[PDB]
Every structure is written in C-alpha cells, then in structure tokens.
C-alpha cells in the first residue's frame, strides 16, 4: 500500500479509514497532517510499504522527499533522505524514487526510506552510471509535434489555427505574448490535451504560478498529465522552489532520453517572484528590478533544448503584455528574442469575440526548414502570401470561415490551391 | 564574400542589422569565405548571450575554434570571456600571426557592461555609465592594425531597433567612431548617408550663403563601376 | 587539542611539537608558551633559523585573559589591556635579523565562534603582522580544498623577497582573477593548477594564454 493511493483519495475515504480502525477526531486537521497521522498509526504494525515522490536537498546535507499530489509542498508528509543515500546511490535533486519506507521510531517525526526499488522509473543499480545534463549537446527541433487533434469542435478549430500559424517542434523553446483576458490559459489547455491525445508517448507537465485557485482546480481536472500549481496566496519562495524543483526534475527526466513538455503560465510572474526573493545587487534597472534577479528565470527559460542522442525538453512559457506595469515590459524585452518561436495575440480581436486571437503576421518560428519538408514549407508559405495582405482580424475571420467547412488541415491546403 | 574584399586586412568594421534580418547565416557565409579564401589567417568566431543551439551550429559548421557564451549564465561570464579573448588576441599579435574575429554582438557586450559596471555617478540619458562606454572603447580600439608584421582585423555585429532604448545610443556613438558599417534595413541607411541632424542644422538657416568653394565642396558622385555581379553603382560623398 | 590529531601530526611532521590538553588549566599553557618562545629566541640568537607554527593565537590569548588576574582596567566585555599585552609581545617577537638568524612565526586565529572575545583580539592584532592570509568557510560548502581565497589575501613588501618576474606574473594572475567571481576564481585556480606539474610551467601556461 503506497502513499500515492491514499494521497489521491478524497476526504471521504480518509475519514472512513480513520473511523474504521480507531482514529478519533480526525476530521478537524489539515489533509497532509491527516494522511501523516493515519499512515503512522497504520504503520505502527511494522508493515513496510512502497513510496513515491520527488527528492530535493536543502542547505544541509540532509534531503527531503515530496509528493506530486501535495502540489510539491513541504509538510508532515515529507520523507527523510539521509546523505548516506546520496552517496550510495549517486542521488541528485529531482530523481523520482520508489521503494520501501521506514516507520518512524523514537527521535524522528517523518518517515524514512528503508530501501530503493525504482529510480526515475528504472532499476537503481543500472542507473548508477549516467550522463550529466551539462555536457549534453543541443540540437534543433527536428521532430514535428503534430497536435492536430481532429475531434470536431471549434476548440479543434483553434488547434488547427495555431497549426497553420505556428510550427511546434519537439524540443523547441517557445514564448507566448498576449494581453490579459485574451485566451492564454485555455490555449495552454489546447496544447496540453492535444499533446495528450496525439502524443501519449511523451510526458505532459503543466506548471502554474500565482494563479487563482479556481483556475488551478479546473486545470487539474482537465489535463491528462500531472499538473503542478501554486496559487498567489503562498509567498514568493513557494513559487521559486516549485519552479526550481520542477525544472530540475524535468532535467532529470530528459536525462533518461525522455520527451518532456513544460507549460508555464506565466514567466513574467516567475521573474517577479525571483526579483522579490533574490537579494539586491545594488544595480537596479527601470521598474524596481535589478540585474541579477532576471538571470534565474532567464536561465530557467534557456534550459529548454533538444538532445542529439536522445530526449527533448520543450518549454512553452507565457509572457504578460501591456498590463500597465513597467516591469512587465522590462521582462518582456529582456526575454524577447531568446526563444525558438514566438506566438503573439491581440486583445482587440478578442473584443469582437473572434477566437483565438493569434496575430498571424506577428507569429513566427525559427529554422522552419529543418523542422518540416520543402513541400509543406512552400504550402504554408503560399498561405502566408495570400493571408498577409488583409488585416489580422479579417485574416482570422477568413481563415476560420473557410476552415470550418474543412475537416483537416491537409484538405484545407488542397482546397485552397485550386482557388 | 571574401573578407579582404569587404573588411580588408588590419582595419576594423561593423555590420548592423535589425531583428529578423538574416544574421546567423550571413555570419556563416563570412566564416567559410574566410576559411577557403584565406586559410592562413586564424579564424575566431565568438558569440555572446544567444541560444545554445545556434552556438553549437556555429561551432559545428566551421573549422576554427568558437569560444561562445550561451544566454543561460549571467553577464559576468560574458565580460570575463571578453577580456580573455582580447588577451589571447594580444598574445597572438605578439606571436606574429594574423587573426580574424567574428564577434556577435557588440551591442550585447556593451549593454552587458552597462548592467555589470559598478555605479560611478557618470550615468547619462537612459542610465548609461561612462565607464560602460570607454571600456567598450578600449576593447574596440584594441583592434588597431599591426604595423610591424601581420595584420589583425575584426568584423563587428550590432543589433538595431530591437524595441528598446539602450541600443540606439551605443549605435550612434559607434556611428561617431565607426570605420565602415554595412547596413541592411531601410531607414538607417539614409540616416547615416544623409544625416538628418545635419540636414536640420542646415535647414535652420535654410540655404546658407556659403561663400565661394564652400558651396561647391558638397558633391555627390554616382559611378556605375564594374562589379562581378554586374554594374554595381558606387556613390561617394565628395567634400573639398 | 584532542590526543588523536596531536599523535597523528607528531609523526606526519619530523619537527618537534609541543601540545597541551584542554582540561588542564591555562596556566601551564602560559608556561609552556614562555619556555617555547624563550628556547626559540635562544636558538635564533645562536645565528640559527627558527620557524614556529601556532594554533591558535586569539584563543590562547582568550585563555591567558581568563587565567591572568584582572588588573582593574576592564575594557569592553571584560577584556584587559594587560591580558592582551603578553600575547601581543609573543606575536611581535617575530624578528628577522640582518646580522644573522631568523625567528619566523606563523600563527592562526579563529573567528565566528559566537563570543566576541576572539573578535576583539582579532582587530587588536590585525595589521601587526608582516603578512595576512584571510580564510573563509564559504568554500567548504562546495567541497573544495584548500579554501584559500586569493583576491583579499595579501602580504607586505613583495618588492624585496624575490625577482620581479614572479611579481609581474603574480600581478597578471591577480588582475585576471580579481574582478571575476570568488567561487569562479577558486575553481579556475584549482583546475588550471591541476594538470600543470609545477609552478614554473603554471606561470608559462598563463603566459601563453
Ligand atoms: N476557442 C474558444 N472557445 C471558447 N471560448 C473562447 C475561445 N477563445 C476565447 N474564448 C473566450 O475568451 C474568454 C477569455 O478567455 P481566458 O482564457 O479566460 O482569457 P485569458 O487570456 O486566460 O486571461 P486571464 O486568464 O483571464 S488573466 C472566455 O470567456 C472564453 O469563453
Ligand atoms: Mg486564463
């Protein structure tokens, strides 16, 4: 009986299990404390059980292990990781470990780890020798991320719209810029469930920071892959450590020649949190933001790449535009030009309720030649020629109109050529 | 194509481009032109704070060593790699050997110096420190020709109209100090060849009554000189 | 010092060593101090070189202050001028002689202990030595030894000890290592000195670089 099963179950199962075998007044404490107490009481019988989570190392040599369902929160559910484990299994941050856990004896509160049985979804012994991420060789996004879902709704119409306006590649680095109330979050949804439906092989990861709790809870119940989200109620350090540990966990996953995709909303919020938490360097720019603050989220964004010998790391991060606050710009032109692709949106298109609001002319990609073939490259270039003249709102109206009657993007291509 | 055709030997020069203008492949073409036409000269491709994939592509599509700094690490790495490349260039000068440097980009290096230089109270419009000005001046003037033997030369890359305000100030002071500056975009060509500032100064006095040859000094010659492409015109601003 | 490391260092080094245990009173520490310095200065006066290694000067000054009776002139925190007077003479006994002999003393001081005594001795003693080698704990987190930072480490009168060739190469290393980062400096120096066999070749490989 692993921690994951009772961690995932709702309150009803927890309270029923507590009242069945002798937990008193268990309904009036926080859920992480509830699972801690009930699992400690159950493990008082000395039955070793499996564990799951992601480990991290604090300032001291001792390390902790967290759970994904707990939104990567440090609490009573944390699992001990002794430094001896770090030496004897070359452990580093972000490795997902599965194995027997140790019930707590006198002198300790949390649960320790008896043994390891699965490191990064792999046998611990064969993972002792491994290639570090630092010396990996970046490469272009050769593999096209075919996200055309083909289900039959206007949401699929939006999917086809950014298929015709963007070239999403496996392992690329993408930025999304849009004004508030333009369609960012559920565009990221589109990306998430389209990747889930079209590419089940690759793992889906969605990172949300300082977002409203209702958005978090509707995102958690809509995406197939696991999603990590920390609301605005928590301090800046919460978001900072969430982002660090999630990006380095994705690093560890892609080190195993895996295809990892991270959807970030937003990156401006991450930069603001880092600026808040980082010590001042004494060299402040316009808007109350100093120099070294921007480095951390900016290397964070730069972590995305494609590995020549196996594995890819795609990051699709949103950037806020024209919100009336100067630092939002500061970040906007600080990250501008550092992404493999840019996706722009306009609020005025959303004003007339034409959706999505992607700016066809402004949106673009770097090195389209290597990603696709020559025939489809020219086939999209001729669309660029024919759709460039009229206005972007007129362009989108025209595109959605003559794409509504067409089942797929290809049939759209051969239906345009005859005209 | 050939560096001797464009940059020659011993003299500095710049190329300035806007975003989305074709910088990377142009630098590639310059690189292999140097490699084939003049294999004797030591190739040196340098990159500052740009995407790692392009760094790998640069260092894999050329033969010379490419010391580059991706855009992940902070600007201290950029500044210190700047001093160490300039010191190794000076050593190669003492080695009695010619070198060619393809740096990209000097606007990146200049505003990295700006955001890293300690505050000295000599800031100007836009918070540009004077130290972050004449340290780049020292680096850019270290590219002088070697009159005793061999000839060092560098090709410069600069970015224009990037939606910011820091870049055009250093661009105009490079204009003040530039030897030769290749241009790609539309407006800045007329901005340089026909200075709008000088035009406004002249128009403030309208047609200034320049006595005698002072009026005839300003001359413009367009010669359709023979070029391998075929009849490429050359326009010269003849002054006295 | 504890017996184990004392016994270990006794037969790592061939030089004579005198060590004293913590539990016994500081008075015997004081006495062994004056006998060791007196025999050292007698050997120096015989035109023979002497090198002394000491650990630690500020904490033995603390011990002397604790064991010395209070003269009545109490400074901040109970410190006495006469309490630091004897360690001050002990440390200043280091005296090179042009006629003959030498009495080199290399003593260490401990700071960041929670008691400002050792601090007070530190700013009362700093600047009175012909050299200084600052050392910090910030390097041991990254597990790099030695933890000898180079930017703020210095010495007095380099122009006389050796030839200006080593001086100018050291100056070049300083100017290429000072503005750049501290952890960066430490890793750079350890790596660049790792594959190099000797210091002469190390200077040569900076020169070629
Ligand atoms: N393809 C679409 N299908 C349905 N509704 C859409 C579509 N595109 C936009 N909308 C509407 O757009 C409105 C705003 O969408 P949001 O995603 O909430 O905006 P936003 O860009 O996320 O900005 P935030 O999250 O409020 S700060 C909603 O009322 C949606 O109904
Ligand atoms: Mg939203």
Characterise this structure:
Chain B: It is an enzyme of class 3 (hydrolase). Chain B: One of its GO terms (cellular component) is membrane. Chain B: ATP binds at residues 8-13, 20-25, 51. The structure is cut from a larger assembly and holds 3 copies of chain A. The first copy, chain A, is an alpha/beta fold. Helix content of chain A is 40%, strand content 17%. Chain A has helices at 3-8, 11-21, 31-43, 83-88, 154-165, 184-198, 213-220, 236-255, 268-277, 291-302, 326-335, 347-351, 368-371, 374-387, 392-404, 409-417, and strands spanning 50-51, 54-57, 63-66, 79-81, 97-102, 112-113, 118-119, 138-139, 173-178, 203-211, 227-231, 259-265, 305-307, 312-320, 341-344, 364-365. In chain A, strands 8, 9, 10, 11, 12, 13, 14, 15 and 16 form a 9-stranded mixed sheet that branches. In chain A, strands 1, 5, 6 and 7 form a 4-stranded antiparallel sheet that branches. Chain A has a 3-stranded antiparallel sheet with strand order 2-3-4. In chain A, helix 7 links the parallel strand 10 and strand 11 (227-231). In chain A, helix 5 (154-165) crosses helix 6. The longest helix of chain A is centred in the middle third of the chain and has 20 residues, at 236-255. The relative contact order of chain A is 0.11. The interface between B and C is small, with 7 and 7 residues. The site of magnesium ion has 2 residues of chain A, from helix 6.
């Amino acid at each position: 009986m692993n921690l994951t099963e009772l961690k995932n179950t709702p309150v009803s199962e927890l309270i029923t299990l507590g009242e069945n075998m002798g937990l008193e007044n268990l309904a009036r404490m926080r859920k992480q404390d509830i699972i801690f107490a009930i699992l400690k009481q159950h493990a008082k019988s000395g039955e070793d059980i499996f564990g799951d989570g992601v480990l991290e190392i604090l300032q001291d040599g001792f390390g902790f292990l967290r759970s994904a369902d707990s939104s990567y929160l440090a609490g009573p559910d944390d699992i001990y990781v002794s430094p001896s484990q770090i030496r004897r299994f070359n452990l580093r941050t972000g490795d997902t470990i599965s194995g027997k856990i140790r019930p707590p004896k006198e002198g300790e509160r949390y649960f320790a780890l008896l043994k390891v049985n699965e490191v990064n979804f792999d046998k611990p012994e064969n993972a002792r020798n491994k290639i570090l991420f630092e010396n990996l060789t970046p490469l272009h996004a050769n593999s096209r991320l075919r996200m055309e879902r083909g289900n039959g709704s206007t949401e699929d119409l939006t999917a086809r719209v950014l298929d015709l306006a963007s070239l999403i590649g496996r392992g690329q680095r993408g930025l999304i810029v849009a004004p508030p109330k333009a369609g960012k979050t559920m565009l990221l949804q589109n990306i998430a469930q389209s990747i889930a439906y079209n590419h089940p092989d690759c793992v889906l990861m969605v990172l949300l920071i300082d977002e409203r709790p209702e958005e978090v809870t509707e995102m958690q119940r809509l995406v197939k892959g696991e999603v990590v989200a920390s609301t605005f109620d928590e301090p800046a350090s919460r978001h900072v450590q969430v982002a660090e540990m999630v990006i380095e966990k994705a690093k560890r996953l892609v080190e195993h020649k895996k295809d990892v995709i991270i959807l970030l909303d937003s990156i401006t919020r991450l930069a603001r949190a880092y600026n808040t938490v980082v010590p001042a360097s004494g060299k402040v720019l316009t808007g109350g933001v100093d120099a070294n603050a921007l480095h951390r989220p900016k290397r964070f964004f730069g972590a995305a790449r494609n590995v020549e010998e196996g594995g890819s790391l795609t990051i699709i991060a949103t950037a806020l535009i024209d919100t009336g606050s100067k630092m939002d710009e500061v970040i906007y032109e600080e990250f501008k030009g550092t992404g493999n692709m840019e996706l722009h949106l306009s609020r005025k298109i959303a004003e007339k309720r034409v959706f999505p609001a992607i700016d066809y002319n402004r949106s673009g990609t770097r090195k389209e030649e290597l990603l696709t073939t020559q025939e489809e490259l020219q086939k999209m270039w001729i669309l660029r020629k024919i759709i460039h003249p009229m206005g972007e709102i007129d362009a989108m109206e025209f595109l959605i109109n003559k794409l509504a009657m067409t089942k797929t993007n290809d049939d759209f291509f051969e239906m345009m050529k005859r005209s």
